[PDB]
Amino acid sequence: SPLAAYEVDDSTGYLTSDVGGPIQDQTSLKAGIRGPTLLEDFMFRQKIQHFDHERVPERAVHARGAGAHGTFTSYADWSNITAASFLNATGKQTPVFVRFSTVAGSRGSADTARDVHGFATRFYTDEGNFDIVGNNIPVFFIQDAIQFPDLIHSVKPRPDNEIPQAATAHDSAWDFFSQQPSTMHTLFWAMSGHGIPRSYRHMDGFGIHTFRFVKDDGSSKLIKWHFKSRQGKASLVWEEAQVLSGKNADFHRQDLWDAIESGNGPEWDVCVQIVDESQAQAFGFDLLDPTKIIPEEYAPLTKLGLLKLDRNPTNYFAETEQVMFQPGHIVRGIDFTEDPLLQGRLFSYLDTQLNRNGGPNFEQLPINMPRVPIHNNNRDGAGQMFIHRNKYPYTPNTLNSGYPRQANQNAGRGFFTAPGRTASGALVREVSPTFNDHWSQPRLFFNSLTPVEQQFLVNAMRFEISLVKSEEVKKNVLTQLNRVSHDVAVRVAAAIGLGAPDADDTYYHNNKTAGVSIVGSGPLPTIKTLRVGILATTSESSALDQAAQLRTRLEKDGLVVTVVAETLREGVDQTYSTADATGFDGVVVVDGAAALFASTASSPLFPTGRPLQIFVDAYRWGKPVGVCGGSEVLDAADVPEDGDGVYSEESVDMFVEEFEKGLATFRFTDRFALD
Amino acid sequence: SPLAAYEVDDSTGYLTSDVGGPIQDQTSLKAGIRGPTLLEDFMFRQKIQHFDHERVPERAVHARGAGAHGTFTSYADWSNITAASFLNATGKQTPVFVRFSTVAGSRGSADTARDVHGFATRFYTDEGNFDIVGNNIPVFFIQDAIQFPDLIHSVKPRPDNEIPQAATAHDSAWDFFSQQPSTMHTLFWAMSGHGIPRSYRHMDGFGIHTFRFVKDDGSSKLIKWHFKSRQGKASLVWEEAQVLSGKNADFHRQDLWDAIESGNGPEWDVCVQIVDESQAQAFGFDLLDPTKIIPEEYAPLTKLGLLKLDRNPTNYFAETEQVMFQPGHIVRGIDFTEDPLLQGRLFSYLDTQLNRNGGPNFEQLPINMPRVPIHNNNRDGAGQMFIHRNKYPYTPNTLNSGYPRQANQNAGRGFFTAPGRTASGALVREVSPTFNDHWSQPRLFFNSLTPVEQQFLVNAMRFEISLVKSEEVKKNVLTQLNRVSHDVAVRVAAAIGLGAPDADDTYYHNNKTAGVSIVGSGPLPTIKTLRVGILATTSESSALDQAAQLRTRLEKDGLVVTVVAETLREGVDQTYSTADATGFDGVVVVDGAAALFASTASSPLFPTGRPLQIFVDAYRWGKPVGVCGGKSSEVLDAADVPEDGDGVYSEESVDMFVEEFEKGLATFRFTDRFALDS
Amino acid sequence: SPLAAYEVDDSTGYLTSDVGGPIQDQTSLKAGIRGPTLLEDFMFRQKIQHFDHERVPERAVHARGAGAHGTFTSYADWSNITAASFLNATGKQTPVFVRFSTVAGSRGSADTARDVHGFATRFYTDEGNFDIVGNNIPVFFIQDAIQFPDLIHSVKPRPDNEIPQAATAHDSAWDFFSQQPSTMHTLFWAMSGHGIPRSYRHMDGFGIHTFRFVKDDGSSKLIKWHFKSRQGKASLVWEEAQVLSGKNADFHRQDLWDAIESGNGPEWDVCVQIVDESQAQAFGFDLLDPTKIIPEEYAPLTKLGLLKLDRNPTNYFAETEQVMFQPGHIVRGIDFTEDPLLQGRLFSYLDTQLNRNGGPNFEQLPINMPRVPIHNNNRDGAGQMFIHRNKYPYTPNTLNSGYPRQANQNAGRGFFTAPGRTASGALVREVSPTFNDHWSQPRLFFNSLTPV
Numbered sequence A: 001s002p003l004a005a006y007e008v009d010d011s012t013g014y015l016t017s018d019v020g021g022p023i024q025d026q027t028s029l030k031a032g033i034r035g036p037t038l039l040e041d042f043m044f045r046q047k048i049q050h051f052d053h054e055r056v057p058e059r060a061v062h063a064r065g066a067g068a069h070g071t072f073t074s075y076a077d078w079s080n081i082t083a084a085s086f087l088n089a090t091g092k093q094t095p096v097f098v099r100f101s102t103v104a105g106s107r108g109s110a111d112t113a114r115d116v117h118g119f120a121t122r123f124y125t126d127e128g129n130f131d132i133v134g135n136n137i138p139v140f141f142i143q144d145a146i147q148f149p150d151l152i153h154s155v156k157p158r159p160d161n162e163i164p165q166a167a168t169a170h171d172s173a174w175d176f177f178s179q180q181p182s183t184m185h186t187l188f189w190a191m192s193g194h195g196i197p198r199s200y201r202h203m204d205g206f207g208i209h210t211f212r213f214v215k216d217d218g219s220s221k222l223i224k225w226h227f228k229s230r231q232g233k234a235s236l237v238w239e240e241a242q243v244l245s246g247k248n249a250d251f252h253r254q255d256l257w258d259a260i261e262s263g264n265g266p267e268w269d270v271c272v273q274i275v276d277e278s279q280a281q282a283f284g285f286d287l288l289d290p291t292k293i294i295p296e297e298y299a300p301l302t303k304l305g306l307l308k309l310d311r312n313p314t315n316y317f318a319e320t321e322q323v324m325f326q327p328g329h330i331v332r333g334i335d336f337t338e339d340p341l342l343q344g345r346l347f348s349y350l351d352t353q354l355n356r357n358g359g360p361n362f363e364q365l366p367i368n369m370p371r372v373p374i375h376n377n378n379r380d381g382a383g384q385m386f387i388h389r390n391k392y393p394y395t396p397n398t399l400n401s402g403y404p405r406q407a408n409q410n411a412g413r414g415f416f417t418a419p420g421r422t423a424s425g426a427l428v429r430e431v432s433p434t435f436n437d438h439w440s441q442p443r444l445f446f447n448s449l450t451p452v453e454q455q456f457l458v459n460a461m462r463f464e465i466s467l468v469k470s471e472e473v474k475k476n477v478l479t480q481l482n483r484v485s486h487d488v489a490v491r492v493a494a495a496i497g498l499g500a501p502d503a504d505d506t507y508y509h510n511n512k513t514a515g516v517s518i519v520g521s522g523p524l525p526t527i528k529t530l531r532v533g534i535l536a537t538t539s540e541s542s543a544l545d546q547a548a549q550l551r552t553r554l555e556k557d558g559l560v561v562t563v564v565a566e567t568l569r570e571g572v573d574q575t576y577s578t579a580d581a582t583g584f585d586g587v588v589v590v591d592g593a594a595a596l597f598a599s600t601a602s603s604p605l606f607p608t609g610r611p612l613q614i615f616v617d618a619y620r621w622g623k624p625v626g627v628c629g630g631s632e633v634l635d636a637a638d639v640p641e642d643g644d645g646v647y648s649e650e651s652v653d654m655f656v657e658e659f660e661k662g663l664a665t666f667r668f669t670d671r672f673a674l675d
Numbered sequence B: 001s002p003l004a005a006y007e008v009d010d011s012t013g014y015l016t017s018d019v020g021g022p023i024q025d026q027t028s029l030k031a032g033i034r035g036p037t038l039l040e041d042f043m044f045r046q047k048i049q050h051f052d053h054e055r056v057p058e059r060a061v062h063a064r065g066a067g068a069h070g071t072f073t074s075y076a077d078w079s080n081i082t083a084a085s086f087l088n089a090t091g092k093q094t095p096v097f098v099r100f101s102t103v104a105g106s107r108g109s110a111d112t113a114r115d116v117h118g119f120a121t122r123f124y125t126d127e128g129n130f131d132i133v134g135n136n137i138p139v140f141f142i143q144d145a146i147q148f149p150d151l152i153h154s155v156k157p158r159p160d161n162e163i164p165q166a167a168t169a170h171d172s173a174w175d176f177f178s179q180q181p182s183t184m185h186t187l188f189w190a191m192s193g194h195g196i197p198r199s200y201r202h203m204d205g206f207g208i209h210t211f212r213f214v215k216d217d218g219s220s221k222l223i224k225w226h227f228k229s230r231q232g233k234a235s236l237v238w239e240e241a242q243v244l245s246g247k248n249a250d251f252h253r254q255d256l257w258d259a260i261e262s263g264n265g266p267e268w269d270v271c272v273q274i275v276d277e278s279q280a281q282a283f284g285f286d287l288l289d290p291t292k293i294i295p296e297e298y299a300p301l302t303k304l305g306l307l308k309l310d311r312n313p314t315n316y317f318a319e320t321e322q323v324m325f326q327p328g329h330i331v332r333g334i335d336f337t338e339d340p341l342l343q344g345r346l347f348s349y350l351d352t353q354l355n356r357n358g359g360p361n362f363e364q365l366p367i368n369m370p371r372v373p374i375h376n377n378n379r380d381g382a383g384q385m386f387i388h389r390n391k392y393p394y395t396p397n398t399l400n401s402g403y404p405r406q407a408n409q410n411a412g413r414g415f416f417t418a419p420g421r422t423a424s425g426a427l428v429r430e431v432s433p434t435f436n437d438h439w440s441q442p443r444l445f446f447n448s449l450t451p452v453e454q455q456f457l458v459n460a461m462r463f464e465i466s467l468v469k470s471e472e473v474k475k476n477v478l479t480q481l482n483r484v485s486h487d488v489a490v491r492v493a494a495a496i497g498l499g500a501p502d503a504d505d506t507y508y509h510n511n512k513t514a515g516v517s518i519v520g521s522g523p524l525p526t527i528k529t530l531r532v533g534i535l536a537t538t539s540e541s542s543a544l545d546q547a548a549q550l551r552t553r554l555e556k557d558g559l560v561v562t563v564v565a566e567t568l569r570e571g572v573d574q575t576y577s578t579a580d581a582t583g584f585d586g587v588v589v590v591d592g593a594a595a596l597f598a599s600t601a602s603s604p605l606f607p608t609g610r611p612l613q614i615f616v617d618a619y620r621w622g623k624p625v626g627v628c629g630g631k632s633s634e635v636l637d638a639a640d641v642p643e644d645g646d647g648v649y650s651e652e653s654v655d656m657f658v659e660e661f662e663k664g665l666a667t668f669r670f671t672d673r674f675a676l677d678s
Numbered sequence C: 001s002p003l004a005a006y007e008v009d010d011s012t013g014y015l016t017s018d019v020g021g022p023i024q025d026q027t028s029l030k031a032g033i034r035g036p037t038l039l040e041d042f043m044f045r046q047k048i049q050h051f052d053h054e055r056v057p058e059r060a061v062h063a064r065g066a067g068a069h070g071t072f073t074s075y076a077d078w079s080n081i082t083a084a085s086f087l088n089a090t091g092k093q094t095p096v097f098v099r100f101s102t103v104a105g106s107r108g109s110a111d112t113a114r115d116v117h118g119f120a121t122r123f124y125t126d127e128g129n130f131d132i133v134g135n136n137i138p139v140f141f142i143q144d145a146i147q148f149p150d151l152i153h154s155v156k157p158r159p160d161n162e163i164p165q166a167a168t169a170h171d172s173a174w175d176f177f178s179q180q181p182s183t184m185h186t187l188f189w190a191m192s193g194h195g196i197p198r199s200y201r202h203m204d205g206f207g208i209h210t211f212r213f214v215k216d217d218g219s220s221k222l223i224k225w226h227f228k229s230r231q232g233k234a235s236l237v238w239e240e241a242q243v244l245s246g247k248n249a250d251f252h253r254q255d256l257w258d259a260i261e262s263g264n265g266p267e268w269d270v271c272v273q274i275v276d277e278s279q280a281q282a283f284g285f286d287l288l289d290p291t292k293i294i295p296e297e298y299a300p301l302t303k304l305g306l307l308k309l310d311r312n313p314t315n316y317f318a319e320t321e322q323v324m325f326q327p328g329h330i331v332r333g334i335d336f337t338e339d340p341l342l343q344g345r346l347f348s349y350l351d352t353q354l355n356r357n358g359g360p361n362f363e364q365l366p367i368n369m370p371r372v373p374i375h376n377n378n379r380d381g382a383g384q385m386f387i388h389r390n391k392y393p394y395t396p397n398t399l400n401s402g403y404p405r406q407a408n409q410n411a412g413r414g415f416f417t418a419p420g421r422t423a424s425g426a427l428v429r430e431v432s433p434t435f436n437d438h439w440s441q442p443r444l445f446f447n448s449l450t451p452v
């Protein structure tokens, strides 16, 4: 509603100033036709002042990201576990807006950097805006919010030269990770495929912190939020991610945009783990510690409702850039915990909007407005867009008949702090000793990945640590990695020419947990939206016919098909010059195009070797690949015909049926070497 | 209200955050009943953050002021002199918002400082917002906008100690005035009663600069804007103004507010002088020079329409504080001239809103919004409220079919610069010699005042210049004033114990012009809203009766009546403790209260001598005063007021008393009570 | 460093607040060891408030870039052609700071996008800061500054979805180019290897506009600035640039930084073409039109001096992010022309610094300060760092003895507008017909390239 009221249509009409005076804006007013521009040209100055002031500070973290509208629908009346109004009835719908992001990069940095990712969700509830400001990884680097600028200074570019962009592959970051062992768990997640998701739709969301569900009788339970993807879990490989950062920095935002435009809006089951207050230390670690997960073997997930994103913004700046999330946007039926990471966040997100917005009335921007009436005695401030009719904005008053009325647990559906909560003890700047195991869970996570996934994680660390210049930092990194796993430390040390420290088995173990592996999570549950590149030629009308035949068969099943040839024409979407294997989830060469794949093939229309390099890159990166028409191509690529995920069929139908199974498998991991 | 779409009502409902979450706001969340406050108390921090951020920079000038909504109505179809849409039909109405102000004082300074006054009018026209950003004085201190910081630094407080507030009565101001002779004309105005108007309703507004009216055929004429009060012109006296500043700093804003609430919303005829382009230098001065008026004897006023203010704001900060006027808010049919003061203003008022608002989307505030659609390619910026559908905001485009289309003289009702305008010559930083007579028009104004009015102007200068510490500066002041009038320099010099310099008659003359004198502008055309204090007593039930009878008779005629007595009760509005002569336009004592006027009278309920002081001050400041009931000698003798004085009334009959007293309210001030230099 | 006065050393000492109280910053203050954080924890709040407020708006264009300090050295006394003090003696040295950039991308976008590039140079002269705010391409896309938002909207990402980053390869850009044919000359330059230079050191810098040199006697000549690389000209190839954008988004800034650190600081000869006022239309186009070059065959380069960059910044944000260039930073001896693109720039760069800095005292930032005294009556404003002793900051005054004195052509080495300049005619919003050939110069350029 606040959005619809502020939509501005410029599909017709004459140009006006911001005060509705019709004007022009194409030629400056000058003293003669070859003369100096005049100060009295208000048309020039208003247009250029606006331009000059377009930009606002980027977000201090998560500067790079993209958003969409949708709806949350409750599966049930959840009154038995929370008073939350948005959860109080089967089928109850609440509008949402979600923004997804990286963490370290500035605006304009690439989507496919290796990083932690944001997953921030606003529920415009009938009892106020409720935000769950989460990440795609369920644990955080640090245990106390006061350390956030340390973490973030260390990962962001070195501040003398501002190098490197959007990367932890520098001395300072690994200096911090090695000195602050709490970082191990999130580190291991970021060095897995969770640091390079295939799309925002193929990752989960996590609140990280323990929160409370509070009932209308005052009782509480402890919860963790999990948003579980209905699209499946999928990652890129690092070598692919690096090329994609160059070829399409906008890959995740375009994937989102496109999925929504085609009627394939992504979905998640909004879930919780729910445990009793008495179980704060029962699972072998402290539920106040944001570097720990509750293994699902100890507390299963309950599905609360469906999150669907199905509408793109109208103006990115107004909606996506200006959305201002806060964990302080809480509603009756939810409460905080004493997680010292959460506790400090509550301060930060209120304060930082003053930086972004430049003034205190940021909740008035349409994307930040609620969908219920606002009744309070907040007044004035720069940018004040309301005209308040209550001329006695103080409590207690008689002159406004004691309105607005105080809301609390007893009346008015007020927020209230869970009334069972207490504090006791000295006023301290001390870390709880219950937070001191920094290594067991990183090992739990590592144990739960498949062998090739473990290899990819090792290889990520090998990559990044080999770029650390400091020999001491690199030694200190091995010291910490060795506390998680001696084998990781040895394997990583081998790439950097150092020896690993001797095994220290204090935290070693062989326990695993379900639901953290990407490679182990089975085939994708849908292939709709996945991209197939068909490599063809204009030389041979046979090639274009085969391509068209595959197109119809793949499109029917919701795949996005790109036919690539030397030059554009009817049925060809993309020239070889602009094509890359990073643009596809699977690649098919029509056998009529075989000539383009020869070592001597050359054209002024694309770079030498491009058609073959698309095919070979796709294969090396694990993708389903094949040749359709029943040979030259598989041999030019040194691609084995018997390999899993390599397809070779004369029959278009048999080809598509086999090829679509391989898109669901998504990645053929047998093509990656192990230690 | 014209801003009803933006109104928020809080007459019902439970307290919420700004995101609609019901909350409380009266107790902090604490770790135990006697414990420390918690960081997780979001209720506390959202509330206090908002409080901590309430303030915005005051305006760089005109910080002290007040506003109201109203309606402009055209008297005619003016399409034969201007294309301006708001003037294009008889009876055509346009919403307005007006803010009045002083100039030098900060927020919270007193309304009744001696100063220039602003009068800034927004017309929310059907072809865009059009602002006339004027003053109550028709001429400006300086002739080029680049000098404005110099002027304003010199008048504003000295920057080491920030003293004095809201006053030109200090060395720096008079240094600048004496060094920059352009200032003489506005200085003479500010030192007249125009520097201390009775109210905003009793002053005129002027655009100061020559502008252009431009027809749809592209022809132009030169115009001056003159908003002429239908309430009459009136001033305070200085001795009164000084007290009033202390007793009621809000006097002008309260007067306006009250007049609108009572259904007596003030009115002005919006008028122009209209002259041809060929007359730019025909009147003996340059029409580009903002230190000159065109005498009404050379060019008469044409009444274009009625401005009436009739609705107070709902939220002062949102509407009055935030209104951001600009002379760059111009409409088709009006154009600029090459007046160097005007030319630079155009820059300043767009820039300065960035300071006030903190971001570039200030035209989106409700009070600044137009009442017609906006179609342009301005985008983003902090605080962006709009959600623009056009995703191709560049010209020229095909992907948005070429919209928005360019508007100009021939299409779309565009603004256009008057096509007859030209420029010639070297690119220069020099002053036109046509601007060099700084002294003839100040003398024209002074010549046009009555003798008591001229004494008041001399006394204002005596007062201020006596507070200048520097003997140098004071001599330089006398040097400049002497160029306007030797008699002024002599009479000022006498108070400060210097000799005036020898006469220099270069610019002396005896010409006069109509319409600049307050004292000479004849009785007020209406007495509605004027204030009558009735001084009574609770000791005599007959004095209360007398007061009640006078109340009924005066209220019939639209006077604001206050009955004063020792204590409040039914029919008594104010105590002597809170009353003052600055609160009234006339003072009546009921003769049943004579005992309160004796030298010996004392009470713990009010300061010694308060009833009599009210009467004596009112008399000494020129107001109509009297005693009603027939026994007048005890009160008049205590006050040293002669029963036969002009504007002194004594009648037993309430009806006759009121008939006579009302004539005196229209006369307004009895100027025979002020001494003149021989 | 030239900014040594403002440096802060933290190689020793105990952690303090901003007001010098020693503190800690690693654990929050809590009501109990597993308790909630306390509002009275000022250590936490001061630290996190600073963090929360670290960012400032990126530049509206040229957001992605990097800078270095160096020195300019005059080859001669140029008194013959300009009163500019920095050019008045052989060997005269002036400190400089230079920032290089792309145009369209935001912060964090890749260095090796295909784009126009900035080359902005500040000379911290003994008669005031003088900036030449240039590009590596000598011509601009448009002929009137009022059009800049249109160009820039069209080349920046589409505003519904903010796609694509740092690229002209989208409908809106090519729509604008094809509807505004002025854009052809720059477009051909940007689609050449000049759009993907090998490094900032392997590109030239151009002022683009005609400016004036003005002598002390008031006479003037028309000039174009050229900064000619002593490293040579080199480009990437486009396939290579695309991969490099992914592998190393920081390639140009690293190349620069490393060159300086190794003692290979890059050099340019600072040159001008110098023609008479009477030649404004003599070359077959109008010297007021920023979409045209003067062919070197018509006016040769004169070498004025040497630009060498040889010192990297100490704090990128303080120095590089904060440097606020302006074409209005001009000195006696130089003047503007009536190029309608230049004319409107003069407004933009003073105004935009209010957005970036959030207040009016941005010339007080160390990187923006001049290296000579400041004497004026500018006062107050948010962030005011000066404590002004003159309590009579108005002119004309007696109470401060008439100081500061006015400076002009004849007194105090004032800036002055070239006194031969004039204007004639109607006040118009019309384009000179002398600007109308959008296509010959693009062809000239294309013809000058080799076959490959």
Ligand code: HDD
Residues within 6 Å of the ligand: A059, A060, A061, A062, A065, A099, A100, A101, A117, A118, A119, A120, A133, A134, A135, A140, A144, A145, A146, A148, A207, A208, A209, A290, A323, A324, A325, A341, A344, A345, A348, A349, A350, A352, A353, C048, C051, C052
């Ligand atoms: C003490 C400070 C602090 C700490 C410990 C954290 N953050 Fe945060 N976060 C910020 C301070 C902050 C911020 C500076 O306040 C940001 C920048 C922009 C904004 O609105 O808030 C932000 C932004 C931000 C966003 C981007 C929201 C958007 O798309 O606009 C996400 C998703 C997260 N954070 C998620 C997290 C998670 C899951 C954390 C740990 C569980 C976390 N942050 C800890």
Ligand code: HDD
Residues within 6 Å of the ligand: B059, B060, B061, B062, B065, B099, B100, B101, B117, B118, B119, B120, B133, B134, B135, B140, B144, B145, B146, B148, B207, B208, B209, B290, B323, B324, B325, B341, B344, B345, B348, B349, B352, B353
């Ligand atoms: C070069 C600068 C400059 C000059 C020469 C003037 N002013 Fe001005 N004026 C401003 C710069 C300014 C300003 C700094 O831009 C203000 C402060 C607040 C605002 O909106 O504009 C302003 C405010 C302001 C206001 C207050 C409007 C309101 O109520 O909000 C009035 C009535 C005037 N001025 C009137 C005048 C008149 C009649 C002038 C001469 C004919 C004049 N000003 C010259």
Ligand code: HDD
Residues within 6 Å of the ligand: A048, A051, A052, C059, C060, C061, C062, C065, C099, C100, C101, C117, C118, C119, C120, C133, C134, C135, C140, C144, C145, C146, C148, C207, C208, C209, C290, C323, C324, C325, C341, C344, C345, C348, C349, C350, C352, C353
């Ligand atoms: C009407 C506005 C306008 C126009 C026509 C131009 N520019 Fe500009 N330019 C700006 C408005 C602007 C700006 C918005 O004012 C920027 C953003 C940051 C800043 O300081 O100024 C800017 C920044 C900017 C920078 C970055 C400086 C730095 O590194 O901090 C360079 C190098 C240029 N521009 C170069 C040019 C050249 C060579 C132009 C044409 C010859 C040009 N600009 C036309």
Ligand SMILES: [Ca+2]
Residues within 6 Å of the ligand: A158, A170, A171, A172, A173
């Ligand atoms: Ca580093």
Ligand SMILES: [Ca+2]
Residues within 6 Å of the ligand: A192, A193, A194, A235, A236, A453, A456, A518, A519
């Ligand atoms: Ca993986």
Ligand SMILES: [Ca+2]
Residues within 6 Å of the ligand: B158, B170, B171, B172, B173
């Ligand atoms: Ca003084």
Ligand SMILES: [Ca+2]
Residues within 6 Å of the ligand: B192, B193, B194, B235, B236, B453, B456, B518, B519
């Ligand atoms: Ca008077």
Ligand SMILES: [Ca+2]
Residues within 6 Å of the ligand: B415, B416, B417, C428, C429
């Ligand atoms: Ca025009």
Ligand SMILES: [Ca+2]
Residues within 6 Å of the ligand: C158, C170, C171, C172, C173
């Ligand atoms: Ca586009």
Ligand SMILES: [Ca+2]
Residues within 6 Å of the ligand: A358, B358, C358
């Ligand atoms: Ca600000």
Ligand SMILES: [Ca+2]
Residues within 6 Å of the ligand: B428, B429, C415, C416, C417
């Ligand atoms: Ca000059």
